[PDB]
Amino acid sequence: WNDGKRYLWLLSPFIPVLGLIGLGLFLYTDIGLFTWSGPLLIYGLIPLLDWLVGEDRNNPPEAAVAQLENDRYYRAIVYAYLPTQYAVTVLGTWVAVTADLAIWEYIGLVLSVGAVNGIGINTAHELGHKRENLDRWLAKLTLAPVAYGHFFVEHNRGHHKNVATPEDPASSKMGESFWAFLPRTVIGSLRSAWAIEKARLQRNKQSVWSLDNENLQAWAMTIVLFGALTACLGWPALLFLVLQAAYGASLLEVINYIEHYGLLRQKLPDGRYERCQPRHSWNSNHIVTNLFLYQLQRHSDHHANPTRRFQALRHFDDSPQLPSGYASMLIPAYVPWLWFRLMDPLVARHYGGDLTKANLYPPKRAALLARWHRPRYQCTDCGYIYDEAIGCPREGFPPGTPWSQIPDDWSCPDCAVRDKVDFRKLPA
Ligand SMILES: CCCCCCCCCCCC
Ligand SMILES: [Fe+3]
Ligand SMILES: [Fe+3]
Ligand SMILES: [Fe+3]
């Protein structure tokens, strides 16, 4: 079974090359428009190829899935992204602090570098799920230029666990404007990351202000990079880096807004939420954007099986579908009323006119209800095996720890989507 779209994945590592070409053209021909090579590319060009080329509801055969995850080329693709984002950042900073510029082209440079680092954040997300030790460090390195390093902890252990619940500071509520959502998600991510790492360290009988704190390990790389650039160039370099990092963080947060807008997970008869399923996240199958990003828009199979590699994701008929691709709907997300008009009918239709099973904004509940309501152990998902003789030293359990001493709320440390009570006791 020939994959077909094998070499077409190369567009994903090609975006930083596009930014580099734009910077080179600006430096050579001295034309201002070439600075805006990022905003134009991700606002007018991509949501034009997305219109030209339609859907694709295709899945790999089950037999071929075994060998798709053992191909080194699909990992070389992701690895190739790294040694061009740093080049783009360095060149952009040098140009912004050295060459004479007007205000608007300075803004264009900021936006271009920020966009490159936002797709860098996407690559970091793709890298941080793999259980290989080297990939975690590579993801931490990738998150450095955008200065948002706590993502590696938060996404892996507080978002994938609290999907589509009124507690997660990463799931939208229907009726909530984006600008009323950005501070909430940013602050909640900070607090949750700090709390998670402090809890783990305290369980390990060690102070939070230690070199083992992964948040500090992630932020040290950003501190080092920014300090080196500032020492080489000066304060304007620091200002430019701060602005571009802010824009990249905004780019990540708008996608977080889009993914799970309005959905909700139903409580089990006992006091816990049901396991995450493909019907708890929006999905789309637009070819061009799924090529420029690493199969990102299929945020159902990944977000219910957070170990399948990006080349083996599937399409599920039960999931809700977006009107278009992600890049197609970024302008109709900064504008609140337009986004509401586009989305609210779709949510109501998906829930069959019964909006008592939706994540409703508390201040706007009554209006929406008036307008729309017309009625040895193993993990069963990722295969991780816990052995009493080996134990889990990272989580604070020394070797020789009987299964009874594990807390009931403990979750699988490869996927964090199954609790202790969901494991299966393997036979001797
Ligand atoms: C939850 C996965 C994070 C995805 C990060 C992508 C952010 C950049 C997307 C830009 C699309 C135009
Ligand atoms: Fe998500
Ligand atoms: Fe993920
Ligand atoms: Fe697991």
Author numbering: 13 to 387, 415 to 467
Quote the study on this structure.
Here we present the 48.6-kDa cryo‐electron microscopy structure of a natural fusion from Fontimonas thermophila between AlkB and its electron donor AlkG at 2.76 Å resolution. The solved FtAlkBG structure is a monomer, consisting of both AlkB (residues 13–387) and AlkG (residues 415–467) domains, with a total molecular mass of 48.6 kDa. The FtAlkB structure is mostly α-helical, with six transmembrane α-helices (TM1–6), two partially membrane-embedded short α-helices α2 and α3, a long membrane-associated amphiphilic helix α4 and six other α-helices outside the membrane. The diiron center is coordinated by nine conserved histidines and one carboxylate residue with His137, His141, His167, His172 and His314 coordinating Fe1 and four histidines (His171, His272, His311 and His315) and glutamate Glu271 coordinating Fe2. Additional density was present in the active site of the cryo-EM structure, allowing a dodecane substrate (C-12) to be modeled with its terminal methyl group in close proximity of the diiron center. The linear dodecane is oriented by hydrophobic residues, such that its terminal methyl group (C(sp3)–H bonds) is 5.3 Å from Fe1 and 4.8 Å from Fe2. The proximity of the substrate terminal methyl group to Fe2 suggests the Fe2 center may be more directly involved in C–H bond activation. FtAlkBG has a long, hydrophobic substrate binding channel starting from near the middle of transmembrane helices TM1 and TM2 and ending at the diiron center. FtAlkG sits on a positively charged surface of FtAlkB, adjacent to the diiron center. Although there are two irons in FtAlkB, the [Fe–4S] cluster in FtAlkG is closer to Fe1, that is, at 13.6 Å, than to Fe2, at 17.1 Å.
